[PDB]
Design an enzyme around this catalytic site. Structure first.
Site, short mmCIF file in Angstrom:
data_model
loop_
_atom_site.label_atom_id
_atom_site.label_comp_id
_atom_site.label_asym_id
_atom_site.label_seq_id
_atom_site.Cartn_x
_atom_site.Cartn_y
_atom_site.Cartn_z
N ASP A 37 0.95 -1.35 -0.19
CA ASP A 37 -0.07 0.05 0.04
C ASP A 37 0.83 1.19 -0.06
OD1 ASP A 37 -2.23 1.26 0.04
OD2 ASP A 37 -2.86 1.07 2.00
N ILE A 56 -3.28 0.09 13.74
CA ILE A 56 -2.96 -0.62 14.64
C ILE A 56 -1.54 -0.36 15.53
CG2 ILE A 56 -2.55 -2.65 12.62
CD1 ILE A 56 0.20 -1.76 12.00
N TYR A 82 -0.67 -7.34 12.79
CA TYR A 82 -1.85 -8.06 12.51
C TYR A 82 -1.67 -9.59 13.14
CZ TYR A 82 -3.35 -4.27 9.45
OH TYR A 82 -3.71 -3.23 9.03
N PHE A 99 7.11 0.46 7.47
CA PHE A 99 6.33 1.49 6.74
C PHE A 99 7.24 2.77 6.61
CE2 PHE A 99 1.77 0.43 6.54
CZ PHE A 99 1.64 -0.43 7.36
C1 LIG Z 1 -8.75 1.63 1.29
O1 LIG Z 1 -7.83 1.88 2.07
C2 LIG Z 1 -8.12 1.73 3.51
C3 LIG Z 1 -6.59 1.23 4.38
C4 LIG Z 1 -5.94 0.09 3.84
C5 LIG Z 1 -6.64 -1.54 4.35
C6 LIG Z 1 -5.61 -2.63 4.68
C7 LIG Z 1 -4.31 -2.41 4.91
C8 LIG Z 1 -3.32 -3.67 4.92
C9 LIG Z 1 -3.64 -1.03 4.61
O2 LIG Z 1 -2.88 -1.46 3.16
O3 LIG Z 1 -4.57 -0.08 4.46
C10 LIG Z 1 -2.44 -0.71 5.18
O4 LIG Z 1 -1.48 -0.21 4.58
C11 LIG Z 1 -2.38 -0.76 6.96
O5 LIG Z 1 -2.13 -1.51 7.19
N1 LIG Z 1 -2.78 0.70 7.59
C12 LIG Z 1 -3.32 1.69 7.06
C13 LIG Z 1 -2.56 3.22 7.41
C14 LIG Z 1 -2.55 2.93 9.15
C15 LIG Z 1 -2.06 1.71 9.34
C16 LIG Z 1 -2.74 0.56 8.94
C17 LIG Z 1 -4.00 0.14 9.86
O6 LIG Z 1 -4.09 0.04 11.05
O7 LIG Z 1 -4.99 -0.20 8.92
C18 LIG Z 1 -6.45 -0.24 9.39
C19 LIG Z 1 -6.48 -1.93 9.57
C20 LIG Z 1 -6.86 -2.36 8.20
C21 LIG Z 1 -7.73 -2.01 10.58
C22 LIG Z 1 -7.82 -3.44 11.14
C23 LIG Z 1 -9.42 -3.71 11.26
C24 LIG Z 1 -9.58 -5.10 12.04
C25 LIG Z 1 -8.71 -5.07 13.39
O8 LIG Z 1 -8.85 -6.47 14.02
C26 LIG Z 1 -7.09 -4.98 13.03
O9 LIG Z 1 -6.36 -5.45 14.01
C27 LIG Z 1 -5.07 -5.65 13.86
C28 LIG Z 1 -6.89 -3.70 12.27
C29 LIG Z 1 -7.44 0.54 8.68
C30 LIG Z 1 -7.43 1.93 8.84
O10 LIG Z 1 -6.38 2.47 9.17
C31 LIG Z 1 -8.94 2.68 8.98
C32 LIG Z 1 -8.55 4.24 8.86
C33 LIG Z 1 -9.57 2.33 10.19
C34 LIG Z 1 -10.78 1.31 10.14
C35 LIG Z 1 -11.26 0.70 8.87
C36 LIG Z 1 -11.67 0.94 11.51
O11 LIG Z 1 -10.80 1.32 12.59
C37 LIG Z 1 -10.10 0.10 13.10
C38 LIG Z 1 -13.02 1.71 11.38
O12 LIG Z 1 -13.88 0.88 12.24
C39 LIG Z 1 -15.32 1.16 12.27
C40 LIG Z 1 -13.13 3.15 11.55
O13 LIG Z 1 -13.19 3.75 12.90
C41 LIG Z 1 -12.72 4.11 10.62
C42 LIG Z 1 -11.88 5.18 10.79
C43 LIG Z 1 -14.30 4.64 10.00
C44 LIG Z 1 -14.24 5.16 8.53
C45 LIG Z 1 -15.53 5.14 8.23
C46 LIG Z 1 -13.09 4.23 7.86
C47 LIG Z 1 -12.05 4.48 6.75
C48 LIG Z 1 -11.67 3.63 6.15
C49 LIG Z 1 -10.26 3.80 5.75
C50 LIG Z 1 -9.58 2.93 4.98
C51 LIG Z 1 -8.59 2.87 4.52
C52 LIG Z 1 -7.65 4.31 4.08
#
Ligand SMILES: CO[C@H]1C[C@@H]2CC[C@@H](C)[C@@](O)(O2)C(=O)C(=O)N2CCCC[C@H]2C(=O)O[C@H]([C@H](C)C[C@@H]2CC[C@@H](O)[C@H](OC)C2)CC(=O)[C@H](C)/C=C(\C)[C@@H](OC)[C@@H](OC)C(=O)[C@H](C)C[C@H](C)/C=C/C=C/C=C/1C
Length: 107
Positions: A37, A56, A82, A99
């Site tokens: 990513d 994370i 993860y 990262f």
């Molecule tokens: C399409 O791109 C999405 C991110 C992608 C998803 C897959 C990942 C391998 C990838 O590639 O990033 C990464 O590079 C990655 O690892 N990231 C993103 C950069 C910050 C760190 C990390 C992360 O924590 O990702 C996370 C990761 C995939 C969350 C995992 C979700 C499930 C848990 O069990 C994991 O535990 C280890 C963490 C996603 C986010 O940073 C994202 C902003 C937050 C999300 C989806 C949730 O928070 C946990 C959500 O829950 C309701 C929220 O609160 C959220 C802020 C609400 C709004 C409406 C959602 C926004 C969505 C944003 C999504 C993205 C920018």
């Protein structure tokens, strides 16, 4: 844990506080492996709120020790990333992640 290594220095004074929005560009890579990513490629920076469990654990503790304008290499062990389950279809079980993170601004 999380290992933070500086690429470019920040102001060494303006650090994010809990509840602030951090605005970042990042590039994610499996250690000694494939890039998965990048926000740079999308021409659009990533925003999150520190302390609200949106990212994370490695990012939560990594970004908190960065100052504004800093660019750093973050090396994150699986238990701070993860873990045993991975991220389905993208991140394997027991993956060490690296990262490239630049802290652009706070909001
Ligand atoms: C399409 O791109 C999405 C991110 C992608 C998803 C897959 C990942 C391998 C990838 O590639 O990033 C990464 O590079 C990655 O690892 N990231 C993103 C950069 C910050 C760190 C990390 C992360 O924590 O990702 C996370 C990761 C995939 C969350 C995992 C979700 C499930 C848990 O069990 C994991 O535990 C280890 C963490 C996603 C986010 O940073 C994202 C902003 C937050 C999300 C989806 C949730 O928070 C946990 C959500 O829950 C309701 C929220 O609160 C959220 C802020 C609400 C709004 C409406 C959602 C926004 C969505 C944003 C999504 C993205 C920018």
């Amino acid at each position: 844990g999380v290992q933070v290594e500086t690429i470019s220095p920040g102001d060494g004074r303006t650090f994010p506080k809990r509840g602030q929005t951090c605005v970042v560009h990042y590039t994610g890579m499996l250690e000694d492996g494939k890039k998965f990513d990048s926000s740079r490629d999308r021409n659009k920076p990533f925003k999150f709120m520190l302390g609200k469990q949106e990212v994370i654990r490695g990012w939560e503790e990594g970004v908190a020790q960065m100052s504004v304008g800093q660019r750093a290499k973050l090396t994150i062990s699986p238990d701070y990333a993860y873990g045993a389950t991975g991220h389905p279809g993208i991140i394997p079980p027991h993956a060490t992640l690296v990262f490239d993170v630049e802290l652009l601004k706070l909001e």
